[PDB]
Design a protein around this ligand. Structure first.
Ligand SMILES: NC(=O)c1ccc[n+]([C@@H]2O[C@H](COP(=O)([O-])OP(=O)(O)OC[C@H]3O[C@@H](n4cnc5c(N)ncnc54)[C@H](O)[C@@H]3O)[C@@H](O)[C@H]2O)c1
Ligand SMILES: NC(=O)c1ccc[n+]([C@@H]2O[C@H](COP(=O)([O-])OP(=O)(O)OC[C@H]3O[C@@H](n4cnc5c(N)ncnc54)[C@H](O)[C@@H]3O)[C@@H](O)[C@H]2O)c1
Ligand SMILES: NC(=O)c1ccc[n+]([C@@H]2O[C@H](COP(=O)([O-])OP(=O)(O)OC[C@H]3O[C@@H](n4cnc5c(N)ncnc54)[C@H](O)[C@@H]3O)[C@@H](O)[C@H]2O)c1
Ligand SMILES: NC(=O)c1ccc[n+]([C@@H]2O[C@H](COP(=O)([O-])OP(=O)(O)OC[C@H]3O[C@@H](n4cnc5c(N)ncnc54)[C@H](O)[C@@H]3O)[C@@H](O)[C@H]2O)c1
Ligand SMILES: CC[C@@H](N)c1ccccc1O
Ligand SMILES: CC[C@@H](N)c1ccccc1O
Ligand SMILES: [K+]
Ligand SMILES: [K+]
Ligand SMILES: [K+]
Lengths: 463, 461, 462, 461
């Protein structure tokens, strides 16, 4: 880099390798590159200054350079201590883009990186847009830098957990800028959340352990979009997969999908006692994966009862799905290699190197697909990130922070993109596979009551 | 001395009753509604006009409604979907039913009319249960006065719901409706997993063809198209999928299917030159799933590989241009609901002609026409919703409201998620599944009650 | 004109059966290619074939190929429930002696076989045997040994029949050579496996119309039939567990993604109720036997099964399941033909609303043929092309005409050569529209084969 | 001061040892043999030259052979397959090993000759363990006097077995061999299920490409081709299969794949006109699995869809005409074992060129080159067989026998089924599987001992 020092990455000399991978990923992301080509001339993001907080992967690189290509300045950090691809961060920094991100941050460094996006030369940057994944940056602004939100036109939030936090703020009257729920586009939720975890969960388990999965027993906690994709990731490898759920509709889907639905607790009752644990069930499990976005769904008593040498991991947004704190307090951790630890249940101080009573924890309980592999593939993230670019254009052009008070009150909300845009994203994805979408005849369009151009479904439609 | 019915053969009743007793053990949600509401008789005074496939599963629905206090007069919503032993058992229990497998079009309309009329006069009906909207349409167009007495319509399927929403939009819908189709325990259970079970079932019964290794084209990839594609893919077919909706097409790709159009560039201009003949010439099986019109058209039928199987699992038989084939090609019956269509001409056929197609159920709903439709344990979810919707509307007594209040109440709505979850829980227990209970801390953490509902109404599952 | 040398359920079903034969011929390119290639040469002219195999539409195409090649035949089914009556009628209406209907009694079953053996009350001058399971072979050796002096060979279809032939060969009681048709790859690894994949869930749906997705199955056996059966149920979304006595087959089940379990605690079958894994069997919604062995779903297992479980057998003989115990102790309620509820509340009557019953399909006989139509034509194409080739080979070798010393040297149970197995497979592939690539001369030399094949050593397992 | 080795980085040894301790808990058949035979020391006096992929799994095999009394000297059988931490741990245990990931061809030969030679002269080897036949070949062609002391060869893989059988047919095989490949617990475990696990694993690690919805062509459908096709189909790829063997092609059709040829009508006449350009222009991924030569040839590589991935999972890299690509096209390294091959020409490339192919592992075994090969619990079966084979040939003592007895025993044999079964039983128990025991009556009924063998030698599984 030149006199440009406004970044922090593991190793800037990985930049050329990162550039090589970005050029490949561009060919895998036709929806995102289509927006680049469509809007480059109009510069719809000219004057936007975007605080971005999301896993600093190669896929995120293509997103960042699309926003910049459309006129935005950005300052970027990762939303997870383990999810950065260091060659991707290096390529972005070498392009002159402020990025503060490396694989293997401490918690203190994770907070520091987010603050380095917020501050430029020790004072708040004149941000006016936010892109977030999980709500951490959104939370830091509302709590520690509320003045900055006076100039911000909106937030575009990537993921289910982040959206939940936004909706709680909106209900409490504490959300200060409008948001777009990017997660609930169909080309995000039912693409990224499900098919992404199908690709990347068994990918990360293989890289982390190289264990044969076929013929072994898995327990997947949760059967939402991530749990659906995770269960398929394992079943298609030949695992015998059981599913836990609190939602009977999602449990019904798991049954019909061919899974046995079980609870870690006798009769499903989690009363906090060891006696409530179905030890017979847990003693047979070779792999447990948490997918819930909830708290403590693989708890201390479950970890005590798991089959020896079971693998434990989490593909939900936050690491508190597993009680890793209990394991930190009571058991000895033996690093196998980065983001793979054997947890010795024989005690706290030291271990027998040949002890047989351990669990294998991946990514210290952080998002396993990003921690132990590379997260979702470019062609899937293409859908999520075309939605992000559209969401950023829409909120920036709305200019919420400049509106009169009455107009602000009518626009202070958490919304999804219109279905027409969802379909236009999907169409580019289908063309990327070489699929050919049929066009309705006028009479056929009239018969089912839609425009030949779409949208083809009512907003109630679930796909 | 009960005579108020018409079935194919009343002596099939005891066989029907044996299968009803079995199906009850397969429908815990529906049977659970019997025990929960029997004491309270929530449908006492209800008089239900019902029009839906007169199968064994519909028999369990009928007797659940009667067990809760209703009187009913029943007909099937398709000419080939009735199981004659089911219709016999219902007739033999003293219930008016007018349905048999293999009705003519005239008999079909007559059967509906026999539910509407008792002793030559309109029955004092006050509730409607419909599957596809045919009964609803006849009442709005031919007996509008009976709608002044009816509290609501509970509609089973996507096509019927579309017809209701046309009326609500035109301001011509006379009573409120429940969209039963769009409960998750209906749409994502019946429409998808039901076709998964019953499509390859009907194709085997009708043809006994090996499916593994052969080429299929599924038109449509909504709930029925997803279930149908899986029905074929799990047998080892090489399945291709056509769609007009790019989101559904995207799901097909991600699900491992090649997305193709019958037409070059996807443009259906009506000409033979528009047809991808190389593609159509390779297809062994085409299945229509759309609820749309003429999605397997005459030029597609002309281009299909010799001895391809053609069938439809959408509600109505106009998805395939069977009118074209009746006019131009000779039909050779193999056995009931299986015809060879000889493309050599209309003036008879060579018994050993190689250039024919095999049509199943004359283009009518193939899973019900050539097999028995969805299995009991799946229809359990759909029909538990139907019962709850009937109670929901009957207890609100729309027809007793003044005109200004009816206007405010007039709608097409789904059942609240809380009922959808309650149905689902009974289905899961029937599999032996054990649902986990949230702790208070966990419920607060995700912002739900321990009792649910566990998802916002925006959630798509 | 006056043909009466048959017995079928209803001759008026002939036109229906012929419609289905014309369709099935278009699904059987290997067999129909043999018909086209050999009809003018008449390689079976003079052959007089006793046939005993399920009288299906597929068998009809096989029968008429043998006749088209010059043979005379006399036919019976090898199972009391497997005949398609419209197929039997069509064959009878063609003037071919056939004795077969769906729903024979055991006495009628034996009568039909003896009607093929005897013509006008006297032994037919048979010189060839085509068998499926060995019942016709057994009757000939026990009751009509003198007929075997004139028979050039037996072509045996199925694993169980082959085992009985090998027993006789070891004991010195086999009187004529046989071709093991089962162990062509285009038979065993086509028919036995993929056939059951197609037809097992087919028969369960037709007999019960039960949802299989989400329910628990136990498949006893993981040979070719157990592999195809397990897949038939898993592809429907059943949760499938597998039992095996063979650890290599058990290893395959594990790698294929199935949990391998035993009905008995620690796998030890001591004959007591206490050895039953009651917790396991109490969860099972469907048990399928696939072993060719005896009493692999036994009385104690039947007592422990989950209420309203389905019980069926897809092995060749019904003694895989202890149905005799059920006849002796429990009351049977017919639901419809080949579907019975077995009430475990007692023998003397039953409550019509009793919940403690099992559903037994086809009275424990081969369920895919008893409750549906067995394997589809395009699969049986492979099996029956092998049968025709095997019939031609043994007929042309003329074993019955050898001196005693030479008969002793020729008495064997053999398989068809790999080159023919490959030629059968090629026609099957073409029927799918598949395009097989041809080796270049240099490639053929590199891997040590002729460009035309055979492409694998005889040790190869596929 | 042990220095008799050569590895990338000896400081990786502790890491390698951690992974060996894990791998041992995943290999119950092989660790079972290690415990069973330790007291007897059946390989005391054995001096084994070993040439096989220096992975963690191979480390557990090496230490089993040493634990049973052998001395060994080891090399990898591929320039890319070594795991450097496994090689380090073995060297740090005092065992001669010459292996690293990313050898040159000259280094590859140097490593093998370092095992053959000790202190500048041929080692007194008396046993050979080989994977692919390269060590066997060098011994026969360059060190034939050493074979006078060697009791046998135990050969891991299909390609090496073929080379043994060619030698035996030509009279040039000098010592007996056991074909380890054809144990069922090797061939139908390693060759098939191992490639199912590790093919998509390598493609993900090398490219991170989405596979669902994309088009693959698998060349070959033997055991590796079957496992490979499943590896890709279970990810949602649309997989087409090519074969020269119509029986294997029949299996592909029945398994739900479309069987196609790169050449029009399957006829490879060496010209571009013979290529099915329409087919190859739609293929996103080509995988060769044959053990044959030039099955992804120059004309196919010219016709492949832009940006297609090309890889080989057969033993040797000549399945793909990489020599043509080296001569004619520019190579851009993406990262180790991943190259963009730019079809625009030889002398340089545009960094933004769109007309390239992605080659993995320079055409060498892709599961080992871009990932870690088969998992320990699969290699457990293969390597248990290897140990049994080494014990059997070392005990036969061929190198000591008189000439007539040699002639009786100069053969390529497989292990007996009883041992194949005992390996499988230990593998099943590792899954927690419970094998049922025959009753005496049942054993008699099917004609087997309660103890096995349970199948005749003809049985194909
Ligand atoms: N790793 C990834 O790449 C990735 C991708 C998308 C989302 N996520 C994260 O994954 C998490 C799940 O997201 P989602 O979109 O599937 O949400 P979702 O709402 O669709 O699914 C979560 C499911 O967990 C279930 N659940 C909650 N508590 C449970 C408990 N105690 N036991 C069992 N089941 C329980 C809920 O009933 C629900 O169906 C979120 O944190 C989201 O941000 C991760
Ligand atoms: N037979 C059964 O058991 C059964 C069960 C439920 C519903 N149905 C019926 O099946 C039909 C479809 O139901 P659904 O719930 O799947 O509806 P749906 O709206 O979910 O799906 C229909 C799909 O067809 C697609 N489509 C429309 N026109 C098309 C065309 N010309 N080419 C390609 N694709 C086209 C639409 O984009 C849509 O995705 C309706 O008639 C419904 O009543 C049948
Ligand atoms: N219904 C059909 O269409 C059809 C088709 C082909 C064969 N068959 C019959 O099916 C049977 C099986 O044929 P196959 O080719 O699969 O034979 P096979 O030898 O390949 O398989 C039988 C399996 O049963 C296992 N087994 C034996 N006893 C057992 C026990 N007590 N518990 C568990 N497993 C046990 C054996 O280890 C073996 O693997 C034979 O009777 C054959 O004739 C039926
Ligand atoms: N990478 C691994 O981990 C691994 C594992 C086991 C074996 N192998 C190697 O993989 C190769 C294949 O082994 P296998 O056990 O599957 O052998 P195999 O004999 O079972 O299968 C090879 C197949 O290739 C087919 N074939 C040959 N030439 C062809 C052509 N021109 N076009 C299409 N198909 C063609 C053959 O007909 C045969 O079925 C060998 O080199 C073997 O040593 C690699
Ligand atoms: C060409 C741009 C346009 N088709 C597009 C629209 C929406 C989303 C992504 C896109 O690439
Ligand atoms: C022409 C006949 C020939 N291709 C054939 C050979 C062997 C088996 C079946 C067949 O149909
Ligand atoms: K990635
Ligand atoms: K059949
Ligand atoms: K490995």
């Amino acid at each position: 880099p030149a006199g440009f020092t406004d970044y922090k990455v593991a190793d800037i000399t990985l930049a050329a390798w990162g550039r090589r991978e970005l050029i490949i990923a561009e060919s895998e992301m036709p929806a995102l590159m289509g927006l680049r080509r469509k809007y480059a001339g109009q510069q719809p993001l000219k004057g936007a200054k975007i605080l971005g907080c999301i896993h600093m992967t190669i896929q995120t690189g293509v997103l960042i350079e699309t926003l910049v290509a459309l006129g935005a300045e950005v300052r970027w950090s990762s939303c997870n201590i383990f999810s950065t691809q260091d060659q991707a961060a290096a390529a972005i920094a070498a392009a002159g883009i402020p990025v503060f991100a490396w694989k293997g941050e401490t918690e203190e460094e994770y907070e520091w990186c987010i603050e380095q996006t917020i501050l430029k030369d020790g004072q708040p940057w004149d941000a006016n847009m936010v892109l977030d994944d999980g709500g951490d940056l959104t939370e830091i602004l509302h709590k520690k830098y509320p003045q900055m939100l006076e100039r911000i036109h909106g937030i575009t939030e990537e993921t289910t957990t982040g959206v939940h936090r936004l909706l709680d703020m909106l209900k409490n009257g504490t959300l200060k800028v409008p948001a777009i729920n990017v997660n609930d586009s169909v080309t995000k939720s039912k693409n990224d959340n499900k098919y992404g975890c199908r690709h990347s969960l068994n990918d990360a388990i293989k890289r982390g352990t190289d264990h044969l999965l076929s013929g072994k027993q898995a327990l997947v906690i949760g059967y939402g979009d991530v749990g659906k994709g995770s269960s398929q990731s394992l079943r298609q490898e030949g695992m015998i997969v059981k599913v836990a759920e609190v939602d009977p509709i999602c449990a019904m889907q798991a049954c019909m999908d061919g899974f046995e639905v079980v609870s870690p607790y006798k009769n499903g009752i989690n009363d906090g006692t060891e006696a409530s644990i179905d030890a017979a069930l847990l003693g047979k499990i070779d792999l447990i994966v948490t997918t819930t976005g909830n708290v403590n769904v693989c708890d201390a008593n479950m970890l005590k009862a798991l089959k020896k040498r079971a693998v434990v991991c989490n593909i939900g947004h936050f690491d508190n799905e597993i009680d890793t704190a209990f394991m930190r307090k009571n058991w000895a951790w033996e690093e196998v290699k980065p983001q793979v630890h054997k947890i010795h249940r024989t005690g706290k101080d030291g271990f027998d190197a040949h002890n047989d009573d351990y669990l294998i924890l991946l990514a210290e309980g952080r998002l396993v697909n990003l921690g132990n592999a590379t997260g979702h593939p470019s062609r899937i993230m293409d859908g999520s990130f075309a939605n992000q670019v559209l969401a950023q254009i829409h909120l920036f052009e709305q200019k919420y922070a400049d509106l009169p008070a009455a107009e602000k009150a009518k626009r202070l909300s958490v919304e999804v993109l219109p279905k027409k845009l969802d379909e236009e994203v999907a169409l580019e994805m289908v063309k990327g596979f070489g699929g050919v979408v049929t066009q309705l005849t006028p009479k056929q369009a009239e018969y089912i009551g839609v425009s030949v151009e779409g949208p083809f479904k009512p907003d109630t439609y679930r796909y």
